[PDB]
Every structure is written in structure tokens, then in C-alpha cells.
Amino acid sequence: AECSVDIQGNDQMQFNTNAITVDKSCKQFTINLSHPGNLPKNVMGHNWVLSTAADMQGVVTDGMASGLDKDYLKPDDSRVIAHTKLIGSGEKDSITFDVSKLKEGEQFMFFCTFPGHSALMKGTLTLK
Ligand SMILES: [Cu+2]
């Protein structure tokens, strides 16, 4: 019914949710990411990245090593199901993905891959 979620990342490196539900009747699902903090992208950038639970650590680790120009994602990373771009204070970005990409019998996590943020900026994404 709701086939979208609004999510915020702030200067305190908090997402305003750590559990997202995706209604299976949704053909597509949309994440609307915003940055209500004051700090710029280069030191407080936030993105919203989706992978299986198992793939999270790898996506984070390799993303951190990728650098700012790459939005802290490994280019062509096969583990990344969907992702917004990286944004700083006052910016916003949306990503819409096909719900068909989420199989039953699997665990999914969302997270920000800006260096260090995933300690706090992460959570679960679950079909409903
Ligand atoms: Cu972040």
C-alpha cells in the first residue's frame, strides 16, 4: 500500500529508522533519502545501500576503500541490490527498485557506506 519510505540521516550519524518493511504487493519500492544535518558530503556524507545481510560487511569494507568520487561504493559491486547516491547537508536523493529482486528465505540489510557510519547507520529490510 505504502510502497515508499522517507529516511533521514543526520550529523549524529543516525538514520531515523532501523527497520524497513516492503509490502509484497508493491511492484517497486522507493527510498527517499534526505540529510537534515549541517555538515558537508566530504565529512558527513550519507547514502542508502541495500544488500543481503551476508554481503553487508564486504560492501562496507570495499566501499570505504573506494573513496569519495565513487560515493564510497566499489564500482560494479555485484552485491549491491539498490542504492541512492551519496549526499551531504541539505541534499536529497531517491532510489526506486523492483521488489522482484528480493527473494523469500533471505535476510536483507540497508546501510550507509560513508567511512565509519555503518556502526550506527544500518538496519533491516524485510518483505511483508
Ligand atoms: Cu553516512
Class of domain 1-128: mainly beta
Cα separation, 117 vs 100, whole angstroms: 29
Here the cell at position 60 is 562496507
β-bridge mates for residue 82, sequence order: 50
β-bridge mates for residue 126, sequence order: 21
Cα separation, 70 vs 67, whole angstroms: 6
Cα separation, 114 vs 13, whole angstroms: 10
Closest CA to 48 of 85, 91, 4, 103: 85
Q: Are the C-beta atoms of 35 and 90 separated by less than 8 Å? A: yes
Cα separation, 28 vs 96, whole angstroms: 6
Q: Are the C-beta atoms of 99 and 28 separated by less than 8 Å? A: yes
- Tell me which method was used to determine the 3D structure: X-ray
Provide the CA 112 distance to its chain's centre, in angstroms: 5
Tell me the three state secondary structure of residue 62: helix
Backbone angles phi, psi at 107, to 5 degrees: -105, 135
Does 121 belong to an annotated binding site?
A: yes
Cα separation, 124 vs 63, whole angstroms: 19
Gap from CA of 126 to ligand 1 centroid (Å): 21
| N-term to C-term CA, the chain | 11
- Domain ranges, ordered by start, for the chain: 1-128
Gap from CA of 44 to ligand 1 centroid (Å): 6
| Helix (H), strand (E) at residue 111 | strand 108-111
Gap from CA of 21 to ligand 1 centroid (Å): 21
Here the cell at position 2 is 505504502
Here the cell at position 127 is 518483505
Does 35 belong to an annotated binding site?
A: no
Does 117 belong to an annotated binding site?
A: yes
Gap from CA of 25 to ligand 1 centroid (Å): 30
Tell me the three state secondary structure of residue 4: strand
Gap from CA of 13 to ligand 1 centroid (Å): 6
